[PDB]
Short mmCIF file of C-alpha atoms in Angstrom, two decimals:
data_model
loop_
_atom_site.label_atom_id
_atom_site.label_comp_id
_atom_site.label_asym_id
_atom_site.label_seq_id
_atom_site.Cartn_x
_atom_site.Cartn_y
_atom_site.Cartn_z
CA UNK A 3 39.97 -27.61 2.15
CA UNK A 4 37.31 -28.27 4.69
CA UNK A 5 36.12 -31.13 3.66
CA UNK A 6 39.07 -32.82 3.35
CA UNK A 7 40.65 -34.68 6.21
CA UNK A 8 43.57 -33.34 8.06
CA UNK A 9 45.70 -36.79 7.55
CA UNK A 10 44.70 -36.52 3.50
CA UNK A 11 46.07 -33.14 3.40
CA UNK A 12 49.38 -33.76 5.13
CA UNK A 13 49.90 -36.50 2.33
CA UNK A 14 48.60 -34.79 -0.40
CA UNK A 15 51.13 -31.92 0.63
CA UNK A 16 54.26 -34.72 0.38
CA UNK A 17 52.78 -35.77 -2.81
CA UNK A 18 52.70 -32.29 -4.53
CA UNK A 19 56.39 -31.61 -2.71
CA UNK A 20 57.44 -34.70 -4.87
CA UNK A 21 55.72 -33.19 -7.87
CA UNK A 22 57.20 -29.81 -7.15
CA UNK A 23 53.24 -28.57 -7.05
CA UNK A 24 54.06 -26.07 -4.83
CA UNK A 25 51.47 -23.72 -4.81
CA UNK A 26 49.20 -26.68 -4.36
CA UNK A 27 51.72 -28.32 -1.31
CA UNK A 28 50.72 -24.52 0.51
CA UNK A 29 46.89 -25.31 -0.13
CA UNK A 30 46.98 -28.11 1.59
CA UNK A 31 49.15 -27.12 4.20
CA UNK A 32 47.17 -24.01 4.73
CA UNK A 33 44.17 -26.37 4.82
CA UNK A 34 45.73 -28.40 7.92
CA UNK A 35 46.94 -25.63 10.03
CA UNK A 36 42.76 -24.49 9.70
CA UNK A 37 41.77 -27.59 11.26
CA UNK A 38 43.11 -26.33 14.59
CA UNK A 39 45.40 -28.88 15.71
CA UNK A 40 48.54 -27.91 16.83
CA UNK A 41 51.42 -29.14 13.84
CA UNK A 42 54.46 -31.52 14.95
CA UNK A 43 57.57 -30.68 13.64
CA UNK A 44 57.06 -32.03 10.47
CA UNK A 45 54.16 -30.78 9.46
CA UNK A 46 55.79 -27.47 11.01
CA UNK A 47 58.55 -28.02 8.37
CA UNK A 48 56.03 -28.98 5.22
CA UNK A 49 54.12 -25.52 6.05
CA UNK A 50 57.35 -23.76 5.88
CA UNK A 51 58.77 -25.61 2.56
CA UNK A 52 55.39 -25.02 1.01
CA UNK A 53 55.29 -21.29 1.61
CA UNK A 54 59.10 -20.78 1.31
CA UNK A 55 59.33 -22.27 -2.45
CA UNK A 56 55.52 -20.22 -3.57
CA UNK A 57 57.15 -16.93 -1.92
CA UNK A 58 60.97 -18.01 -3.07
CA UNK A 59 59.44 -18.07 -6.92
CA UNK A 60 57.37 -14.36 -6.91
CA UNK A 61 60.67 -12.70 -4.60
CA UNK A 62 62.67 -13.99 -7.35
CA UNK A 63 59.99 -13.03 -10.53
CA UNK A 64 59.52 -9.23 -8.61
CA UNK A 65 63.47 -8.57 -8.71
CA UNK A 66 63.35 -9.03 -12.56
CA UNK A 67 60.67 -6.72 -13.32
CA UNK A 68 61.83 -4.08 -10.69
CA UNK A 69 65.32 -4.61 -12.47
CA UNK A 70 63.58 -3.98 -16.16
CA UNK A 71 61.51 -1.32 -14.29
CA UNK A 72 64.37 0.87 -12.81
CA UNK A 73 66.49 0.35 -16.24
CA UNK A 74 63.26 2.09 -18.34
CA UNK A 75 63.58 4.86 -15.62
CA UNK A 76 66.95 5.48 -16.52
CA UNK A 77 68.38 8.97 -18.71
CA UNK A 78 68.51 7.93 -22.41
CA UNK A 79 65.74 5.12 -22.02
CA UNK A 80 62.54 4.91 -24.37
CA UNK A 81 59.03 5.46 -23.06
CA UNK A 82 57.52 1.99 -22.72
CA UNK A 83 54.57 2.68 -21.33
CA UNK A 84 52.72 1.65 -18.01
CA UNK A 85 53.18 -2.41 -18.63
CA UNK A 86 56.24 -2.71 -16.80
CA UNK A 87 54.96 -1.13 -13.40
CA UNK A 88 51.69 -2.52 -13.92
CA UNK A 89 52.85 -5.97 -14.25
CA UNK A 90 55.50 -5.52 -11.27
CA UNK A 91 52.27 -4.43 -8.79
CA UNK A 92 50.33 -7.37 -9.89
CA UNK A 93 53.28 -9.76 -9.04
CA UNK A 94 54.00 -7.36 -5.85
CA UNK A 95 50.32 -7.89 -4.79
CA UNK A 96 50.43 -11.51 -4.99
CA UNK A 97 53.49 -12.05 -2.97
CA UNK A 98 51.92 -9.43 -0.13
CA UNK A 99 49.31 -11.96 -0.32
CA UNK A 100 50.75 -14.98 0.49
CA UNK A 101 52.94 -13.50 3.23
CA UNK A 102 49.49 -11.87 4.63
CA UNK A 103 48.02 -15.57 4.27
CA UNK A 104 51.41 -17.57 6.02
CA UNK A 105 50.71 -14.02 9.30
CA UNK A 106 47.76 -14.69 9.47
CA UNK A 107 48.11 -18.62 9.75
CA UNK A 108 50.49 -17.33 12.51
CA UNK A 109 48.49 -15.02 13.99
CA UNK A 110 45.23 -17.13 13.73
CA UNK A 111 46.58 -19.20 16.06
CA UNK A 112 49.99 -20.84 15.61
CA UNK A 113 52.20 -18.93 17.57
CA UNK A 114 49.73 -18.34 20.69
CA UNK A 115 49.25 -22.31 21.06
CA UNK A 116 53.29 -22.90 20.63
CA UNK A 117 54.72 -23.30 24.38
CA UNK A 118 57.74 -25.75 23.30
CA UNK A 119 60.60 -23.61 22.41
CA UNK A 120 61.22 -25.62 19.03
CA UNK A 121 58.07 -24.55 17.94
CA UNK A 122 57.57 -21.03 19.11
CA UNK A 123 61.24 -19.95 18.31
CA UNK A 124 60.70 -21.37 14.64
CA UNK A 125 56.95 -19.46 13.89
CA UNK A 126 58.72 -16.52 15.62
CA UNK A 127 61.44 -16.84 12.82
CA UNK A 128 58.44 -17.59 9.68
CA UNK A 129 56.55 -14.41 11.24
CA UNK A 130 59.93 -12.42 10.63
CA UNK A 131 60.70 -13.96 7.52
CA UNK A 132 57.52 -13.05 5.85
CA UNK A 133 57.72 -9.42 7.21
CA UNK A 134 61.11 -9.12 6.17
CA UNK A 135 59.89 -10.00 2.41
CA UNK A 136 56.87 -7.36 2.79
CA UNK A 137 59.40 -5.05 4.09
CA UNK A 138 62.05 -5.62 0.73
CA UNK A 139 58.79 -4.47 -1.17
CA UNK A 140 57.83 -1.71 0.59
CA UNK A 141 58.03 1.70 -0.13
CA UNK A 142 55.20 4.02 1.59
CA UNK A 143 54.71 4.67 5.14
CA UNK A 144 54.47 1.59 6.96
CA UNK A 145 57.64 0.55 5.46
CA UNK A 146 59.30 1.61 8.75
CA UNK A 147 56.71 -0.65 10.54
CA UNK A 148 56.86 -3.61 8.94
CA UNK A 149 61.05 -3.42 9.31
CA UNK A 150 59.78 -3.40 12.96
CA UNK A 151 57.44 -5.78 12.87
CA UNK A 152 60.29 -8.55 11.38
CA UNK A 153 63.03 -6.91 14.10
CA UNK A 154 60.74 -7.64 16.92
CA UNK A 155 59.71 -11.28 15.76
CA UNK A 156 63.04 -12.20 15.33
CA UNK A 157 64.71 -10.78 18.55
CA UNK A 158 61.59 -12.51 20.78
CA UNK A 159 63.27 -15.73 18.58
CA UNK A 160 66.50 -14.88 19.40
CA UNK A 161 66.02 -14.12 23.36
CA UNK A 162 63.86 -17.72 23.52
CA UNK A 163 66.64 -19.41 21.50
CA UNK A 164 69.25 -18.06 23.53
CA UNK A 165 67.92 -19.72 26.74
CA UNK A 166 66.40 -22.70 25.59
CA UNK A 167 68.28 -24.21 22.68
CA UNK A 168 72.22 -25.16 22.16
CA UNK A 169 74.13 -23.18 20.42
CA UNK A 170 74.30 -25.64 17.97
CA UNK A 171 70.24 -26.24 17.15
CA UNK A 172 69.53 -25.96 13.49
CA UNK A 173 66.63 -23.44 14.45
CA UNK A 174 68.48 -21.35 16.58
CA UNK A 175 71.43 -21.61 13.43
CA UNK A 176 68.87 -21.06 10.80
CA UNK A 177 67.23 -17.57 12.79
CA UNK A 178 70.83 -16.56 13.20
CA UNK A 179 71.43 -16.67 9.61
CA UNK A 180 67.79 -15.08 8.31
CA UNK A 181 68.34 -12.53 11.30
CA UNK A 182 71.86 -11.39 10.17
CA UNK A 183 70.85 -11.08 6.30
CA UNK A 184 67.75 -8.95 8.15
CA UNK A 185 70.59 -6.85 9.49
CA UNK A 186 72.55 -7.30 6.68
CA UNK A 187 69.58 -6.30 3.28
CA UNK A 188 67.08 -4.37 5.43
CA UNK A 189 68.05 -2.73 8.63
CA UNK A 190 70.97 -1.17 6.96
CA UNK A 191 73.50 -2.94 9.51
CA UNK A 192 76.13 -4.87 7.75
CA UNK A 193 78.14 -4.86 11.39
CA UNK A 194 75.47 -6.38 13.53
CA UNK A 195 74.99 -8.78 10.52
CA UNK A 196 78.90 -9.64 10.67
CA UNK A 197 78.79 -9.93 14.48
CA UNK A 198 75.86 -12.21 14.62
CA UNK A 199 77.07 -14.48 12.24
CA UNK A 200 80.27 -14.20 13.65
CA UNK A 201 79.57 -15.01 16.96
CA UNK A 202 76.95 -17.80 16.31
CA UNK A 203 79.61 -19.46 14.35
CA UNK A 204 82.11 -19.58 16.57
CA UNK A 205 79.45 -20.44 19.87
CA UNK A 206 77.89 -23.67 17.32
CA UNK A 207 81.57 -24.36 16.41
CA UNK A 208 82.66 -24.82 19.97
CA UNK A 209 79.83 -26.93 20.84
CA UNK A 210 79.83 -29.19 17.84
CA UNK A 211 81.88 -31.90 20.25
CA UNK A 212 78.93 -32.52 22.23
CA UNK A 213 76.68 -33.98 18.69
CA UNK A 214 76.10 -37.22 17.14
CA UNK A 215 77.63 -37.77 13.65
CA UNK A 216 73.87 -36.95 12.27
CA UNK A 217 73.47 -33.76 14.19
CA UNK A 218 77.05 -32.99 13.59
CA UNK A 219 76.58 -32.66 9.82
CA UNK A 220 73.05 -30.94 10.11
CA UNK A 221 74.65 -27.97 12.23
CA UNK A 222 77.67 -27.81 10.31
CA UNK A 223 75.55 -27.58 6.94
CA UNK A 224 74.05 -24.26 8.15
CA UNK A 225 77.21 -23.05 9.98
CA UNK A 226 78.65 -23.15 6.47
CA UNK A 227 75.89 -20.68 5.53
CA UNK A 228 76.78 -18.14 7.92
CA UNK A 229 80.57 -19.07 6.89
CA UNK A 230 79.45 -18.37 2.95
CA UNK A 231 77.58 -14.72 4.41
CA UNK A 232 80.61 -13.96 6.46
CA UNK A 233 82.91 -14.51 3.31
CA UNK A 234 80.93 -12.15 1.18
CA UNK A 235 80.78 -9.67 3.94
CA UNK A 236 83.86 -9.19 4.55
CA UNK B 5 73.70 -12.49 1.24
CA UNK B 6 72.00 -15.88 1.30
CA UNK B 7 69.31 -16.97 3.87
CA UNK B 8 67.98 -20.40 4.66
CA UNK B 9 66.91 -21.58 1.07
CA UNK B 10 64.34 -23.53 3.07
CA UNK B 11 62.45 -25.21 0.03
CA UNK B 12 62.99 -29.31 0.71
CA UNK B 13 61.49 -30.83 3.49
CA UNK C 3 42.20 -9.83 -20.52
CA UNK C 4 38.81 -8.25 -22.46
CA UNK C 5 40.09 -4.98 -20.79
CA UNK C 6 43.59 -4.59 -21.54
CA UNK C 7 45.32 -3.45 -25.25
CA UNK C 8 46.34 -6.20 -27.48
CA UNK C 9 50.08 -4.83 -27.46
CA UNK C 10 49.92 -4.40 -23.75
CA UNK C 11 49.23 -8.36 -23.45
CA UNK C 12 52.07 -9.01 -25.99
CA UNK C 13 54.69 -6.93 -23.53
CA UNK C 14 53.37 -9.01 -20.18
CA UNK C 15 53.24 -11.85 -22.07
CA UNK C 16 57.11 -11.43 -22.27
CA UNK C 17 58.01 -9.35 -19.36
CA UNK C 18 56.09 -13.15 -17.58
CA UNK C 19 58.47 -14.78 -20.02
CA UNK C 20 61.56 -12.86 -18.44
CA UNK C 21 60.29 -13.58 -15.03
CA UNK C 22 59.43 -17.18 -15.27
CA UNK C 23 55.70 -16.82 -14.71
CA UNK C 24 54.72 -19.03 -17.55
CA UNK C 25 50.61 -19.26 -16.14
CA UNK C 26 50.17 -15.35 -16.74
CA UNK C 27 52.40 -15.50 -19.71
CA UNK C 28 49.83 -18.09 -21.28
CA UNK C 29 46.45 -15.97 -19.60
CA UNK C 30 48.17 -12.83 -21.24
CA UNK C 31 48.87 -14.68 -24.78
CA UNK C 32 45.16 -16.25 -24.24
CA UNK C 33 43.87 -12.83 -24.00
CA UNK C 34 45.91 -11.39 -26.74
CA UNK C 35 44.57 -14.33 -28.97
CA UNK C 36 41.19 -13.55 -28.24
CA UNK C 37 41.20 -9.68 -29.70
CA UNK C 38 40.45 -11.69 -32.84
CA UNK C 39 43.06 -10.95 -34.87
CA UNK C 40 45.65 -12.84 -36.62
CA UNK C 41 49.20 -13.56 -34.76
CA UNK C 42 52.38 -12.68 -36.52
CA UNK C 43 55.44 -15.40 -36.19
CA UNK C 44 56.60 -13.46 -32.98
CA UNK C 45 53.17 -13.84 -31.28
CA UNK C 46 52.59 -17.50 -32.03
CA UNK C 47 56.04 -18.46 -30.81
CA UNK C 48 54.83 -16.59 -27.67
CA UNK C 49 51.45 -18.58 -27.72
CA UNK C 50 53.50 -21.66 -28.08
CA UNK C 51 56.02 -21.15 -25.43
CA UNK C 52 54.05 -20.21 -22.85
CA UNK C 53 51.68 -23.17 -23.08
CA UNK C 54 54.58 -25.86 -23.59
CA UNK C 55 56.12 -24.04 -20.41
CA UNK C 56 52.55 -24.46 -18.10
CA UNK C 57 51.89 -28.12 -19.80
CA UNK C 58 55.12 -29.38 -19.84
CA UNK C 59 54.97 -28.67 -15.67
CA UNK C 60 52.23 -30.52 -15.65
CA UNK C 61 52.93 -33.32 -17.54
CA UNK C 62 56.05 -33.74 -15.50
CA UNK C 63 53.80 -33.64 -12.50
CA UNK C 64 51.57 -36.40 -13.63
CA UNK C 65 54.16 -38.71 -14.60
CA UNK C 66 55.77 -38.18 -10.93
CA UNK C 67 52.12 -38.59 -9.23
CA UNK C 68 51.57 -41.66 -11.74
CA UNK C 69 54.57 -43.43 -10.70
CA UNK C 70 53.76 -43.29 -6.98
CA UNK C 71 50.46 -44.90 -7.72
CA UNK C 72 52.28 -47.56 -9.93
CA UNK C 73 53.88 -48.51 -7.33
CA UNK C 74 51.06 -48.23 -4.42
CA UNK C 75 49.41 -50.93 -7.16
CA UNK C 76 52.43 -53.18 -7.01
CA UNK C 77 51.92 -57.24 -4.92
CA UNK C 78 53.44 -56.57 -1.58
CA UNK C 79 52.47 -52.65 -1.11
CA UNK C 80 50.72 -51.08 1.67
CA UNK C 81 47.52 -49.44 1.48
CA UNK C 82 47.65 -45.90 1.45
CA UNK C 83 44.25 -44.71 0.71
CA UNK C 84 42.44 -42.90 -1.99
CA UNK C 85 45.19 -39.60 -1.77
CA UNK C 86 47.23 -40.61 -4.73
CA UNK C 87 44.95 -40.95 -7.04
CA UNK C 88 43.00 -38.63 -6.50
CA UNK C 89 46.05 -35.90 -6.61
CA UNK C 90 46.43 -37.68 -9.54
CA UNK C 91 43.29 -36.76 -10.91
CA UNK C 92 43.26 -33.63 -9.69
CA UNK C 93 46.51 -32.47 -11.86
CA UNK C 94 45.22 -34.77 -14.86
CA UNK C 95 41.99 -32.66 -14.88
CA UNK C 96 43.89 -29.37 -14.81
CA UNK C 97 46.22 -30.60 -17.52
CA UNK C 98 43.49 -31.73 -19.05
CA UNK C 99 41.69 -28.28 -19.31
CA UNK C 100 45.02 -26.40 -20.59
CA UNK C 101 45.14 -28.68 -23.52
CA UNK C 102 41.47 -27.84 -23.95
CA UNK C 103 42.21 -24.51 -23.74
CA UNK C 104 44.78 -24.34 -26.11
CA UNK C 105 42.80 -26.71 -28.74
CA UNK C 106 39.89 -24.17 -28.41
CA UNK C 107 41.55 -21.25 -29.26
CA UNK C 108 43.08 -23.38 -31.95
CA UNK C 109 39.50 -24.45 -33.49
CA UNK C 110 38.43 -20.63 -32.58
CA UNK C 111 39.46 -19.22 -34.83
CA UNK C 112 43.15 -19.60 -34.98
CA UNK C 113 43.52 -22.57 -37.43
CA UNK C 114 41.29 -21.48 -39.82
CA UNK C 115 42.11 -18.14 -40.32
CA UNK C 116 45.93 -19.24 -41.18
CA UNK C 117 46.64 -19.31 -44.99
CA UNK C 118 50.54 -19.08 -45.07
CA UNK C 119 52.09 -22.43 -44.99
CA UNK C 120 54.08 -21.09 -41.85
CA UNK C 121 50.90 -19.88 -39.54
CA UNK C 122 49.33 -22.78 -41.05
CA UNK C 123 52.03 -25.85 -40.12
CA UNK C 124 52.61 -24.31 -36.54
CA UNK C 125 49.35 -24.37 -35.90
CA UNK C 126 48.19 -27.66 -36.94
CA UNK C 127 51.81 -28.71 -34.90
CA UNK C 128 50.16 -27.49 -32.24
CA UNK C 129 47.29 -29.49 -32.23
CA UNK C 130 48.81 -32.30 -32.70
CA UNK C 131 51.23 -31.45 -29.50
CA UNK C 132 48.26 -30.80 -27.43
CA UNK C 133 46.14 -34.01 -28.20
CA UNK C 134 48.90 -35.65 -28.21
CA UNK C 135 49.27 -35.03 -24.35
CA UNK C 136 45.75 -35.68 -23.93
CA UNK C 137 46.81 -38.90 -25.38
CA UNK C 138 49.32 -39.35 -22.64
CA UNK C 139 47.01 -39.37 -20.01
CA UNK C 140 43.69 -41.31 -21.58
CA UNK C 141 42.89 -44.69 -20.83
CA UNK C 142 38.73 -44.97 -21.56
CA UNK C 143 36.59 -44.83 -24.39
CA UNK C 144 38.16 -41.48 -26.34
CA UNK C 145 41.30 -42.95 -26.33
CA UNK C 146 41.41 -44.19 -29.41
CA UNK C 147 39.87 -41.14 -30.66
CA UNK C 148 42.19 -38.61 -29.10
CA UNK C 149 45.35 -40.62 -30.61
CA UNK C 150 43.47 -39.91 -34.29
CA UNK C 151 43.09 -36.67 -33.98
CA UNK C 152 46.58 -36.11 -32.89
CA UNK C 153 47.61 -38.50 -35.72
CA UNK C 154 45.42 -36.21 -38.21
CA UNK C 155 46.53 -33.06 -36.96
CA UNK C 156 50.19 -33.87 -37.48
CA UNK C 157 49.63 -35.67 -40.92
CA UNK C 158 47.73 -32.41 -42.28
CA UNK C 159 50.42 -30.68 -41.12
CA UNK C 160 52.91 -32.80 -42.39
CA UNK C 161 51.64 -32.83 -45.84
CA UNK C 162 51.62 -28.88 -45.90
CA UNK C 163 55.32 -29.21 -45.10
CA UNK C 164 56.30 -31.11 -47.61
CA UNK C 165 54.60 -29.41 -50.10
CA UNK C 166 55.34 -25.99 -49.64
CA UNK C 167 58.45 -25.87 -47.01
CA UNK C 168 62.20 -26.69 -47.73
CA UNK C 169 63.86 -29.78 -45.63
CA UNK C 170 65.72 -27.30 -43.57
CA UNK C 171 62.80 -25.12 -42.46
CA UNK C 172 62.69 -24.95 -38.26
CA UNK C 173 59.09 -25.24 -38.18
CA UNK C 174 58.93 -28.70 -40.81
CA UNK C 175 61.99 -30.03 -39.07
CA UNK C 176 60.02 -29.62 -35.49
CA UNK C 177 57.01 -31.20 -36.79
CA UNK C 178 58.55 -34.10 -38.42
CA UNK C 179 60.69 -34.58 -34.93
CA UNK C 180 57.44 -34.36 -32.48
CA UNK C 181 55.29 -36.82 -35.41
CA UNK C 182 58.24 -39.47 -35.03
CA UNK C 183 57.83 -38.70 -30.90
CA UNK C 184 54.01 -39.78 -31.89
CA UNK C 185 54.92 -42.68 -33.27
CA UNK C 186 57.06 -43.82 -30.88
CA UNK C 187 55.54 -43.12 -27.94
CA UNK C 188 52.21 -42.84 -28.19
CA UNK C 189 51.00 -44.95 -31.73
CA UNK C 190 53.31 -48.07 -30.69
CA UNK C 191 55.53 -47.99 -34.20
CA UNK C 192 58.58 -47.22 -33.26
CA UNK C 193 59.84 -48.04 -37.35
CA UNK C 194 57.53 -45.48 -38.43
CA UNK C 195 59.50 -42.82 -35.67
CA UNK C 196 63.01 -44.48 -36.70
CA UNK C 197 62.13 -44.18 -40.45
CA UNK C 198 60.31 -40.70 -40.29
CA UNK C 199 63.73 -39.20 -38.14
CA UNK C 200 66.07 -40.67 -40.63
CA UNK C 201 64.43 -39.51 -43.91
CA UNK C 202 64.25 -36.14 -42.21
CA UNK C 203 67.63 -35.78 -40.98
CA UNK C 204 68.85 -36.86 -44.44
CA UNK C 205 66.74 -34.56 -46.56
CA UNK C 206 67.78 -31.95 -44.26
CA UNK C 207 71.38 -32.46 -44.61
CA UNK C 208 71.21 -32.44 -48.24
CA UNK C 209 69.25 -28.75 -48.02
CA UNK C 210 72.06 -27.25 -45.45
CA UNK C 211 74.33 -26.24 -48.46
CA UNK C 212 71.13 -23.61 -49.33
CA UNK C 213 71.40 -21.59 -46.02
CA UNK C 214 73.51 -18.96 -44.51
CA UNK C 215 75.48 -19.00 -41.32
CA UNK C 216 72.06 -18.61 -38.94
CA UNK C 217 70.05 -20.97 -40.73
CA UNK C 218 72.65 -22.99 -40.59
CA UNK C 219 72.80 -23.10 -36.99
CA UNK C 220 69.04 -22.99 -36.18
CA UNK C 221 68.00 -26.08 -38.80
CA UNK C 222 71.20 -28.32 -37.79
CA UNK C 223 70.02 -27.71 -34.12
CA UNK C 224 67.13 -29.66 -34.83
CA UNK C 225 68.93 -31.91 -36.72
CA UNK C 226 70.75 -32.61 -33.55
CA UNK C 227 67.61 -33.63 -31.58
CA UNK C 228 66.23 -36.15 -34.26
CA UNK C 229 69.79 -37.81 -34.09
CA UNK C 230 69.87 -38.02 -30.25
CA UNK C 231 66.33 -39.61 -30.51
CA UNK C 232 67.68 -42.17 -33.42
CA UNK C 233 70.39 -42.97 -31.06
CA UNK C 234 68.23 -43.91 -28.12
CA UNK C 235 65.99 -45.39 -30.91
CA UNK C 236 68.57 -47.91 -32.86
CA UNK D 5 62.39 -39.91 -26.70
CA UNK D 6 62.95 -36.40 -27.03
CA UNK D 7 60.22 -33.72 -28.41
CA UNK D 8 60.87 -30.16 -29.16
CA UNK D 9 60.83 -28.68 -25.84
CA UNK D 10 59.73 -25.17 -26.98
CA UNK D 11 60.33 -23.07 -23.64
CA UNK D 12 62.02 -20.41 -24.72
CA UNK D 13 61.18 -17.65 -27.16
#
């Protein structure tokens, strides 16, 4: 998207949001983080929609075919041949691409220009959100290392959030949530997943006094997420 | 166990 | 696809059905149309799925992107620059090249190897569909000539049905509903849709005493459609 | 005005 300028590519990513072009709305985006600039919040927040919807839509194709995949490897199933695993790699491959492509926008150089803590804690949380979906994939020897690698993003989140943000900001509510379902899906920690959601609950809950009626609602929309987590949980 | 669906700006 | 087995394409092509990946359930039906050989019933509902599934997005992409640049076109509006329309133009000319895809395998060799009334019908349905939404989007010169061949297309097809199909059959009922859709929406005579629906519905009704329980249920399903398009209509 | 919408096989 070189030639195109960075202002046309913003808009052209709210244009294919409203056309729910997604795949497109990451092009572009991608496109505007390579001009160098640093984002403002909400082009922070189109980059994230973008990639969250493309990744949301091959997470969501791989569980069906490792779901037909595991039922063929079943006792008492027919031989179907090598389709099934074939076609689950290809669709594996492509998501391991796009969350190499949203690192690497991270890596190359999001997070190392990001001093406010709004934006550093929320690349921090995208960098362990996209190894936690490499990590629900993976099954060979870095598989340990990339459960590390979305651990250590989100705790270096976590520690900035902690200090910098209320307990009520959606981004420090939103890495509480992703972090405790990290605990919860892939670190094999269901308590540390109940305790963090727990306790960033009831810390968001007891500052809610302190909001506006607009903040008010967006903090209590994700406390009911953790609420909905905490439900299931337990 | 639901995370942030994240998908509307 | 030159590289992979016929059947092979055939099981992705519905394993991508399963998981909602309608673009490589359409390159894997592409491919498996391109081994040459003919397509049982099966196959071309596959074809035909998977292609309604990737144009239909588009289509509904267009009419959003359209819409916006309506409206940046209306007295009163604020400049916006060139972005609109040319996203605009960038999903017409992808939609654009599916259709052409689809008519080309169509012409080559599709069409003309299909003998039985049913192969025969779909197919020419098909074409019809697929200039049809060509139609939807031309406003120079061809316009006029994309409207006749949809026109032509449906009206060969038509004239099969009627000769050699009962009033019940899915694939005649289908036809005649999408034709009337023509008419309607795209050959400004809306009393040759209204007609065309309610000669349809009521020849079909008179055939329902013929079928058994399933028929039953798959023809008057249809039936249903051309009656909720009459009652929008009249 | 509805056409066949064909998405499912």
């Amino acid at each position: 998207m070189g030639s195109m300028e960075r202002a046309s590519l913003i808009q052209k990513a709210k244009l294919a949001e409203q056309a729910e072009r997604y795949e497109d709305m990451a092009a572009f985006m991608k496109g505007a983080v390579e001009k160098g600039e640093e984002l403002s919040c909400e082009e922070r927040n189109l980059l994230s929609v973008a990639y969250k919807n493309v990744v949301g839509g091959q997470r969501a194709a791989w569980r069906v075919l490792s779901s037909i995949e595991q039922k063929s490897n079943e006792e008492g199933s027919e031989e179907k041949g090598p389709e099934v695993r074939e076609y689950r790699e290809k669709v594996e491959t492509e998501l391991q691409g796009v969350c190499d492509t949203v690192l690497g926008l991270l890596d190359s150089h999001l997070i190392k220009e990001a001093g406010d803590a709004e934006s550093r804690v929320f690349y921090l949380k995208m960098k362990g959100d996209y190894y936690r979906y490499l990590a629900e994939v993976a099954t060979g020897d870095d598989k340990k290392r990339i459960i590390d690698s979305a651990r250590s993003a989100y705790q270096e989140a976590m520690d900035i959030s902690k200090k910098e943000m209320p307990p009520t900001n959606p981004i420090r509510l939103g890495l509480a949530l992703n972090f405790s379902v990290f605990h919860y899906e892939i670190a094999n920690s269901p308590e540390e997943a109940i305790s963090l959601a727990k306790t960033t609950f009831d810390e968001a809950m007891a500052d809610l006094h302190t909001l506006s009626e607009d903040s008010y609602k967006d903090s209590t929309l994700i406390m009911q997420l953790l609420r909905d987590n905490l439900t299931l949980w337990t | 166990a639901g995370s942030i669906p994240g998908r509307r700006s």
